[PDB]
Design a binder for these strands. Structure first.
Ligand SMILES: O=c1ccn([C@@H]2O[C@H](COP(=O)(O)CP(=O)(O)OP(=O)(O)O)[C@@H](O)[C@H]2O)c(=O)[nH]1
Ligand SMILES: O=c1ccn([C@@H]2O[C@H](COP(=O)(O)CP(=O)(O)OP(=O)(O)O)[C@@H](O)[C@H]2O)c(=O)[nH]1
Ligand SMILES: [Mg+2]
Ligand SMILES: [Mg+2]
Ligand SMILES: [Mg+2]
Ligand SMILES: [Mg+2]
Ligand SMILES: [Zn+2]
Ligand SMILES: [Zn+2]
Lengths: 926, 73, 186, 98, 186
RNA sequence: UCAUGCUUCGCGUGGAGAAUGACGUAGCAUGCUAC
RNA sequence: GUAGCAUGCUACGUCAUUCUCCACGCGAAGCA
């Protein structure tokens, strides 16, 4: 065995420690991207049969250089030798030795690869994509080995969290240039293969973390000059790591080296199409599918997503000041304006308006509305701003003074509190205690909640998997009907809301909805189909009761965007809200037996059912732009008859320009929104539901493809996995048969109930145990590598007993009670929530009970199901509310008789302090 | 029931401060908000009773605003 | 809805119907009386419905006026009511520190800054008269908010420093009150 | 272990010619994806050096491409890819041997 | 209305009934008079219903007319406000620098984000803490966006003038942060 | 400053159907008068 | 047998209240 160790070294003049035993082998768990006629997927297999000898430095200091010797069969040894003699000249190819060593009496052929790292790139991608907080040794070793951090950095806890420990982004970004050099070396390898006429599939597991390629088992030889390096799974799997590690940060420096200063781009330059094509040619030369830098030229939704992925990657290399509205000077009646005539989206490239009017004569009401909404004139006239309180880009300060907006403490209803305490409440050691309050905020509240939009990062998706997931997710919206509607058919719920900035200076939404006729609204909607209208979304500060001290803000979008998005999603979404028994349970009440029906629909014939749930930590402020664009695209799938592709693209451009990356007016100053979603647009809850379903389907895909494949003892599921790999990384066009089959499989074994960012899942526990459907960890991994968010155990729950119902859904607990020879599920709230609603109120008038008796009737309706709870105090909550309602009615009658001496007690009010009126609200007869 | 009485009293005390125009001093208002929020989500009565003393000292500093003699009759 | 001019008439008609059925008179007269009773009942029903509608409107107006009257009384006495509630609750709490500082403020020994909570921090407090000084200040220790504070400076009314030995009822009239006492928590 | 075509790509006989005139007679072998909806031919293998168009059963005419300088190992029999073919399909045509 | 067009028949019916009650010519003539009264009453009720319906329609039409007129008044009042706002900001543009940058553009189209950064004549910097002040706006003249800005006025969160000599690490806790410094391009 | 949607409670106004009660014009059963 | 009157049923026209469905207005509550 010592003679062997002296021929593995050969003549390279190294020195080897037999890390792997010389003539014996080495066995470990390593991630592979495998696809045979038997097995498929991207899973951690058990590598074996290799001997890995480590190398010592001049000083006796071990380095991460390993000689990997392998035993091969003569027939594959000859083939690999003759396929390596052709690629031997490429710099991005690890050396090989190809010797024959005698074992027993047979000259066994050995292949020795020289100076490979410990881990390959497949290990890095797998570790960063299937991330388990309790199992990270293979990632910690990678990070420490390449001086990304120190071994003591992991003593800190939450070190992996993107929110609790935002410094982890720097640690990951220390891997950027290694990944970039790997990309350059794979491009070199592809060029060598093409020039030598070698045909083969490039996989991540054949490239170590220095970029070298070393395995030629399944390559074949053709005529020189015509080789076909098949890099689809390679790049598609590698894509998320490229933005997680910020691999292209070296492209922001002169000469593309990190030591020289940044590039000082021309300030007036906005069209980076040439640079985008240069980057694509430099790093993705052999990516077959065509790339459109400007998504105006894309062919359909599946081509918009594909090109916007690359635009997301490449827009991190360009100055932040070049993205946004493209302004131009136009003369109206001889007066020069400055109006937006285009846009530069970080994902969609450059878009130019088609109806730009130069040298006009007059501005109609529609034209004034359009020009008074875009930030062109507002920002071009305000003074410069440098806001050091936030990392978000600051555009301008419209006024001469900054506005600081506070939040008030809240009002105390002392009569209710005294009554409750007289009824034996709020004593020491009581299961029910006040936990919901009105919290106050100092001057820096809205600007402090914007620093939470700071959590949105450029995320590049695995585009092939994203396309398949989109095709599958679109089947959850097949029972609905949608399209464009006229202004006559738009239903506005409340017309007494604000119209946004600057339209809130002159009136509410009613003023504008009754000022401009239906013809003007139709004209504006048609205008938005071939032009982009940027708008400003105000940042409003909420005033509500909550259990934690966070200054929650919402987005007051303008009125133009609201009108033009209603004329699309009003008809798209009324059907979603009017449908019963679907996965999305928006529009379904919890009264009159609705909750029971929803749960029984969720439990729909699942075999070994367990319940799971979750809630995204920062849903709106951490949602990647790719998935928001996807949510907008699948909602527009209903416009196949009323809109052409150009109209659909311009509607997407409008949505992105006013609810994805708009300009927000926070305290009299304009800021640029990094991304995420604006909670307060026409499609908040429905877009959130689409995003939730997409994340769930992605989790299931990853769970099914990361399974071994040889261990699955069910033939149908094994074939399903084998074809799921094909339909992602070997099919360019959607296969409807398998999309239907996978949708049916998910519905059978993974039954969802979605309401915005809230979700409940009934899943086959046996399959989830065997790895054949998504567990609660396959969902945390997806959030980590595709949402830049770590989801902790405080946000997810599981239930092995489904006679208890979900632990929480929409802040409602479930209880299996009896009402009339039937066991039904009833929702009850947190008693502290109801008691806090009773004790603390918004206005000072609400602290007078006799004026607000319906206010307590609603709370009693909400709190009735607590009467069935085994805990006595919970029932005492409802009884307290009933007795207080009776007391308020008595006081009101007394006041009326004393002041206005006429009695109006009547008899219809008596039903309010009785339990029947509230019993009838949870019985299935309406 | 002395733990839910200091939270309600803190809410009322910050309400009284707000309508006394303490919101026009950003530093003092920030201190008052910190004390109020800390009292609301406190778990030990002794800590809440020190933060309450601090907040009531803030209120009592403004001698001209309120007349303690009449209110504490 | 009795006492109406219709109801009473109808009632009499009903009595007229009670006699005829007992009288067993001619069919024509019986049907005439039935028709009269029906028309009287219809008239009474009309009048009763109109009266009930008017009463409903009157009650609605009365309740709206009551709501309007009480909303203004809630919004106009917010300042006084809130302060009275605050001090009622503080009286109910019955804490030694809160009560001590409230009583001191009642006597005029108000603070100048926020009472510190740290292990050691500065506190400046007014001392209007020697009586409060002897009640609280003894030697170098000062009792406030149920805690002991080490006196570290006693500024005179003229911003002039005062030695702790200058303060006494024998010499108190000479000095210029109020005295600002600066102390550190112990 | 990631392979180009684990299962040999299916093939059948078809007709093709320089123009749309010589498609009457079948003289070429074509590889087609087995279950891509119907039939989708990826390449044409023939002992000819002038083919530019191919026709298949309604009748559909598919644009061919010039062949790389190829002496395919079973003569000058070329291998014509369909225009617009992607890398994976190009590999399978050669991975399924030619 | 009491004096409806077809009230003559009803008046004649009532008068004839009164005369018959006073006189009572006979039973058959009484029945004929009852029939005439009934037909006149039916016609009168038909006319009254028609008139009430027409009155309701006219009232609704006039209410709609007034609502539309008020809506047009509000539209004409908001159009002037929007025009005034647009023409006010327009006169606020610094035309020399704006024209200079626009002309240098290849196609007269430039990103919005550079219009303030390269043309704004006033800068506002919001400084949370003292380290930020030392880093960015130290001194009476600083550099930003490749331009030299001369500090003009520093105010605190309360919008009160703060002298540049009061911004020091020792006085940092005594200031109402954040400080807003307005500077003028040099 | 206070967004987008969903659900429910109370009150008020308008419209359309069904049940009971009242009055003219027509169809059916019996009785009375003219013949 | 025809016509008129009386009693009892069915078909057209107008009002009296009584419950349903919708259309909007006002106030209120929960939820994402
Ligand atoms: O039919 C197969 C082939 C492979 N495997 C699993 O897949 C792993 C990797 O198989 P492999 O061909 O990639 C090794 P090799 O090509 O020499 O080296 P590199 O990958 O480092 O280039 C094996 O351990 C085994 O668990 C399987 O189940 N069935
Ligand atoms: O009034 C609301 C509340 C919520 N939302 C939408 O519903 C999402 C989730 O709402 P949520 O209660 O779960 C708080 P979330 O943002 O998750 O933060 P935390 O988990 O840290 O509390 C938001 O993003 C937003 O799009 C809305 O439109 N309006
Ligand atoms: Mg090998
Ligand atoms: Mg959430
Ligand atoms: Mg939630
Ligand atoms: Mg492999
Ligand atoms: Zn494209
Ligand atoms: Zn459409």
């Amino acid at each position: 065995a010592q003679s062997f160790l002296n021929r593995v070294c050969g003549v390279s003049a190294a020195r080897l420690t037999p890390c792997g035993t010389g003539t014996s082998t080495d066995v470990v768990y390593r991630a592979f991207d495998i696809y045979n006629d038997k097995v498929a997927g991207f899973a951690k297999f058990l590598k074996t049969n290799c001997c890995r000898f480590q190398e010592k430095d001049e000083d006796d200091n071990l380095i991460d250089s390993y000689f990997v010797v392998k035993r091969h069969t003569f027939s594959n040894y000859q083939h690999e030798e003759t396929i390596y003699n052709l690629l031997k000249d490429c710099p991005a190819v690890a050396k090989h030795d190809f010797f024959k060593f005698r074992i027993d009496g047979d000259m066994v052929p050995h292949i020795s690869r020289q100076r490979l790292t410990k881990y390959t790139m497949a290990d890095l991608v797998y570790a960063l994509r299937h991330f388990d907080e309790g199992n990270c040794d293979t990632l910690k070793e990678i990070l420490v080995t390449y001086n990304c951090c120190d071994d003591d950095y992991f003593n800190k806890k939450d070190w992996y969290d993107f929110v609790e420990n935002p410094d982890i982004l720097r640690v990951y970004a220390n891997l950027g240039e290694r990944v970039r050099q790997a990309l350059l070396k794979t491009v070199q390898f592809c060029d060598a293969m093409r020039n030598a006429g070698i045909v083969g599939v490039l996989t991540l597991d054949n490239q170590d973390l220095n970029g070298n390629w070393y395995d030629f088992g399944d390559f074949i030889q053709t005529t020189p000059g015509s080789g076909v390096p098949v890099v689809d799974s390679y790049y598609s799997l590698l894509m998320p790591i490229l933005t997680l590690t910020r691999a292209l940060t070296a492209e922001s420096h002169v000469d593309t080296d990190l030591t020289k200063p940044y590039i000082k781009w021309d300030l007036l330059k906005y069209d980076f199409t040439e640079e985008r094509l240069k980057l694509f040619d430099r790093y993705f030369k052999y990516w077959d599918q065509t790339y459109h830098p400007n998504c105006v030229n894309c062919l359909d939704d599946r081509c918009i997503l594909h090109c916007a992925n690359f635009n997301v990657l490449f827009s991190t290399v360009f100055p932040p000041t070049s993205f946004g509205p493209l302004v131009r000077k136009i003369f109206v009646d001889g007066v020069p304006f400055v109006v937006s005539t285009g846009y530069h989206f970080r994902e969609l490239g450059v878009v130019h308006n088609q109806d730009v009017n130069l040298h006009s004569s007059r501005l109609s009401f529609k034209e004034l509305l359009v020009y008074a909404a875009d930030p062109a004139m507002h920002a071009a006239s305000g003074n410069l701003l440098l806001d050091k309180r936030t990392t978000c880009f600051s555009v301008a300060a419209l006024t001469n003074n900054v506005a600081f907006q506070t939040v008030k403490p809240g009002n105390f209803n002392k009569d209710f509190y005294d009554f409750a305490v007289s009824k034996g409440f709020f004593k020491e050691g009581s299961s029910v205690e006040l936990k919901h309050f009105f919290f106050a905020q100092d001057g820096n509240a809205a600007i402090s909640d914007y620093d939470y939009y700071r959590y949105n990062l450029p995320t590049m998706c695995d585009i092939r998997q994203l396309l398949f997931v989109v095709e599958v997710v679109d089947k959850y919206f097949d029972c609905y009907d949608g399209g464009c509607i006229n202004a006559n058919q738009v239903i506005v719920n409340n017309l007494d809301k604000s119209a946004g900035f600057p339209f809130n200076k002159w009136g509410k939404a009613r003023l504008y909805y009754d000022s401009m006729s239906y013809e003007d609204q139709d004209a504006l909607f048609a205008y938005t189909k071939r032009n982009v209208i940027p708008t400003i979304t105000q940042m409003n500060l909420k005033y509500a009761i909550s259990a934690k001290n966070r200054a929650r803000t919402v987005a007051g979008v303008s009125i133009c965007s609201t009108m033009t998005n209603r004329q699309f999603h009003q008809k798209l979404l009324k059907s979603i809200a009017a449908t019963r028994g679907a996965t999305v349970v928006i529009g379904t009440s919890k009264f009159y037996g609705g909750w029971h029906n929803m749960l029984k629909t969720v439990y729909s014939d699942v075999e070994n059912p367990h319940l799971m749930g979750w809630d995204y930590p920062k849903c709106d402020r951490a949602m990647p732009n790719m998935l928001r664009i996807m949510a907008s695209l699948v909602l527009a799938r209903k416009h196949t008859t009323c809109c052409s592709l150009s109209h659909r693209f311009y509607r997407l451009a409008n949505e992105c320009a006013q609810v994805l990356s708009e300009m927000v007016m926070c305290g009299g100053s304009l800021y640029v929104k990094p991304g995420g979603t604006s909670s307060g647009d026409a499609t908040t809850a429905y877009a959130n539901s689409v995003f939730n379903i997409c994340q769930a389907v992605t989790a299931n895909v990853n769970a099914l493809l990361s399974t071994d494949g040889n261990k699955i003892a069910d033939k149908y599921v094994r074939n399903l996995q084998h074809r799921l790999y094909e339909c992602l990384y070997r099919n360019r066009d959607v296969d409807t048969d398998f999309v239907n089959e996978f949708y049916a499989y998910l519905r059978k074994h993974f039954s969802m109930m979605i309401l915005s960012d809230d979700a409940v899942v009934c899943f086959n526990s046996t399959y989830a145990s065997q790895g054949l459907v998504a567990s609660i960890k396959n969902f945390k991994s997806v959030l980590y590598y595709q949402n830049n968010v770590f989801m902790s155990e405080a946000k997810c729950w599981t239930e092995t007993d489904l006679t208890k119902g979900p632990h929480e859904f929409c802040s409602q607990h479930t209880m299996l009670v009896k009402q009339g020879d039937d066991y039904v599920y009833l929702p009850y709230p947190d008693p502290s929530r109801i008691l806090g609603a009773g004790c603390f109120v918004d206005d000072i008038v609400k602290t007078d009970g006799t004026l607000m008796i319906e206010r307590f009737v609603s709370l009693a309706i909400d709190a009735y199901p607590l009467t069935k709870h085994p805990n006595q105090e919970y029932a005492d909550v409802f009884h307290l509310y009933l007795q207080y309602i009776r007391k308020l009615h008595d006081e009101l009658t007394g006041h009326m008789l004393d002041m206005y001496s006429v009695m109006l007690t009547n008899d219809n009010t008596s039903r309010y302090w009785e339990p029947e009126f509230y019993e009838a609200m949870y019985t299935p007869h309406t | 029931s002395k733990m839910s009485d200091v939270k309600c009293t803190s809410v009322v005390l910050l309400s009284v401060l707000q309508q006394l125009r303490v919101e026009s001093s950003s530093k003092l208002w920030a201190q008052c908000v910190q004390l109020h929020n800390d009292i609301l989500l406190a778990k030990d009565t002794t800590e809440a009773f020190e933060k309450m003393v601090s907040l009531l000292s803030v209120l009592l500093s403004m001698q001209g605003a309120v007349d303690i003699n009449k209110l504490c009759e | 809805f009795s006492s109406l001019p219709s109801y009473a008439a109808f009632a009499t008609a009903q009595e007229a119907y009670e006699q005829a059925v007992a009288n067993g008179d001619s069919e024509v007269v019986l049907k005439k009386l039935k028709k009269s009773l029906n028309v009287a009942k219809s008239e009474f029903d009309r009048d009763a419905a109109m009266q009930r509608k008017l009463e409903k409107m009157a009650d609605q107006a009365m309740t709206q006026m009551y709501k309007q009257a009480r909303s203004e009384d809630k919004r106009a006495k917010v300042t006084s009511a809130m302060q009275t509630m605050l001090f009622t609750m503080l009286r109910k709490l019955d804490n030694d520190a809160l009560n001590n500082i409230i009583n001191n403020a009642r006597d005029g020994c108000v603070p100048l800054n926020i009472i510190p909570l740290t292990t050691a921090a500065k506190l400046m407090v007014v001392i209007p008269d020697y009586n409060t000084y002897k009640n609280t200040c003894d030697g170098t220790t000062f009792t406030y908010a149920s805690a002991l504070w080490e006196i570290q400076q006693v500024v005179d009314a003229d911003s002039k420093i005062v030695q702790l030995s200058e303060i006494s009822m024998d010499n108190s009239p000479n000095l210029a009150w109020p005295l600002i006492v600066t102390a550190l928590r112990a | 272990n990631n392979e180009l075509s684990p299962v040999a790509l299916r093939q059948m006989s078809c007709a093709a010619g320089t123009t749309q005139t010589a498609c009457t007679d079948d003289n070429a072998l074509a590889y087609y994806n087995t279950t891509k909806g119907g039939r989708f031919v990826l390449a044409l293998l023939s002992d000819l050096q002038d083919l530019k168009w191919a026709r298949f059963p309604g009748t559909i005419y598919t644009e061919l491409e010039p062949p790389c300088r190829f002496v395919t190992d079973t003569k000058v029999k070329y291998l014509y890819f369909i225009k617009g073919l992607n890398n994976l399909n190009r590999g399978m045509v050669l991975g399924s041997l030619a």
